[PDB]
């Protein structure tokens, strides 16, 4: 589309500028343009893609939750009827969120995952696939809610199997995947016990491997481990 005439290196340069300017919609469009050049992405470029889309969808999710709460309050007894506007606007925001998730899923399917052969790239993209199905699940209510949940689970499970065979237990991508799969289990799949088990086993195996790390790698791994502990504190 609109980024077809810009050089790949100029799209990456401008994504970095858009990050500094907190222009995340622009950042996402620059990175979608870069992916569509057809070349694989390096680690730093996967980070730019992830940051851009997480910020865009994160705004949409926050907005959707505010509107869903208002809508739920409207549909209780004692609530004066206000017309179709709250539902319509929640639907508008929901549709836009679904569109961003479908855009990301489409980049991963065409053709990021199929060309990803190293563990860091393949685990990252499969985690991303699980995350964006998870965001679709958060808003799903129809006959496809179960299939959307199963799509997220399958992606996370494929990523988990590769991560456990190919990466050390302190690898940040491995840790971040396990964190988000544990969130899936607790918040989407009605499986709090599976969530707690995964977060505990992940934390314990990482703790045991910290001695192998440099000071800088240690700081990276312990950051995510603190998130696992914060969730265990919340869940128990």
């Amino acid at each position: 589309g609109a980024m077809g005439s810009m050089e790949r290196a100029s799209l990456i340069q401008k994504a970095k500028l858009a990050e500094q300017a907190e222009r995340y919609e622009d950042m996402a469009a620059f990175m979608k343009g870069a992916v569509e050049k057809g070349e694989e992405l390096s680690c730093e470029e996967r980070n730019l893609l992830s940051v851009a889309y997480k910020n865009v969808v994160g705004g949409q999710r926050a907005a959707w939750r505010v509107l869903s709460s208002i809508e739920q309050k409207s549909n209780e007894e004692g609530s004066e009827e206000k017309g179709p506007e709250v539902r319509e606007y929640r639907e508008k925001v929901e549709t836009e969120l679904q569109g961003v998730c479908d855009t990301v899923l489409g980049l991963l399917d065409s053709h990021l995952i199929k060309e990803a052969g190293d563990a860091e790239s393949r685990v990252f993209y499969l985690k991303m696939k699980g995350d964006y199905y998870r965001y679709l699940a958060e808003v799903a209510t129809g006959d496809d809610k179960k299939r959307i949940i199963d799509s997220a689970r399958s992606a996370y499970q494929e990523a988990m199997d590769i991560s456990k065979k190919e990466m050390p237990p302190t690898n940040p991508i491995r840790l971040g995947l396990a964190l988000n799969f544990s969130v899936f289990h607790y918040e989407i799949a009605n499986s709090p016990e599976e969530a707690i088990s995964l977060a505990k086993t992940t934390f314990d195996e990482a703790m045991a491997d910290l001695h192998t790390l440099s000071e800088d790698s240690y700081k990276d791994s312990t950051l995510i481990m603190q998130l696992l502990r914060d969730n265990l504190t919340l869940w128990t």
Partner: peptide
Amino acid sequence: IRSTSTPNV
């Protein structure tokens, strides 16, 4: 209220 997922880093 909601569980913490991976942040932007």
